[PDB]
Amino acid sequence: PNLFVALYDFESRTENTLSITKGEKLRVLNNTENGEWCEAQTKNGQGWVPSNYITPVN
Ligand code: NA
């Protein structure tokens, strides 16, 4: 399973991050060893977001 929803709006100016809106669904494509960031896919493309800003959806 790799479906999640954003807990909060997240928007960074940092290159290679993805902006997400609270309530938006996303899928996780890649993780990191420490689990703090993950590469997400939404209708707006792909990029990295903080893992603590998302939560799974069955
Ligand atoms: Na995090």
UniProtKB/Swiss-Prot annotation:
Q: Which residues carry this modification: Phosphotyrosine?
A: Y8, Y53
Q: Which residues form the SH3 domain?
A: 1-58
| TM region(s), chain numbering | none
Determine the domain of life of the protein's source: Eukaryota
Q: Where in the cell is it found?
A: Cytoplasm, Cytoskeleton; Nucleus; Mitochondrion
Annotated tissue distribution: Widely expressed.
Q: How is it modified after translation?
A: Phosphorylation at Tyr-8 by members of the SRC family of kinases disrupts SH3 domain-based autoinhibitory interactions and intermolecular associations, such as that with ABI1, and also enhances kinase activity.
| Family statement | Belongs to the protein kinase superfamily. Tyr protein kinase family. ABL subfamily.
Q: Which disease is it linked to?
A: Leukemia, chronic myeloid: A clonal myeloproliferative disorder of a pluripotent stem cell with a specific cytogenetic abnormality, the Philadelphia chromosome (Ph), involving myeloid, erythroid, megakaryocytic, B-lymphoid, and sometimes T-lymphoid cells, but not marrow fibroblasts. A chromosomal aberration involving ABL1 has been found in patients with chronic myeloid leukemia. Translocation t(9;22)(q34;q11) with BCR. The translocation produces a BCR-ABL found also in acute myeloid leukemia (AML) and acute lymphoblastic leukemia (ALL).
Q: What does this protein do?
A: Non-receptor tyrosine-protein kinase that plays a role in many key processes linked to cell growth and survival such as cytoskeleton remodeling in response to extracellular stimuli, cell motility and adhesion, receptor endocytosis, autophagy, DNA damage response and apoptosis. Coordinates actin remodeling through tyrosine phosphorylation of proteins controlling cytoskeleton dynamics like WASF3 (involved in branch formation); ANXA1 (involved in membrane anchoring); DBN1, DBNL, CTTN, RAPH1 and ENAH (involved in signaling); or MAPT and PXN (microtubule-binding proteins).
Q: How does it assemble?
A: Interacts with SORBS1 following insulin stimulation. Found in a trimolecular complex containing CDK5 and CABLES1. Interacts with CABLES1 and PSTPIP1. Interacts with ZDHHC16, ITGB1 and HCK. Interacts with STX17; probably phosphorylates STX17. Interacts with INPPL1/SHIP2. Interacts with ABI1, ABI2, BCR, CRK, FGR, FYN, HCK, LYN, PSMA7 RAD9A, RAD51, RAD52, TP73 and WASF3.
Q: What is this protein called?
A: Tyrosine-protein kinase ABL1
Placed within the complete protein, the shown segment runs 63 to 120 of 1130
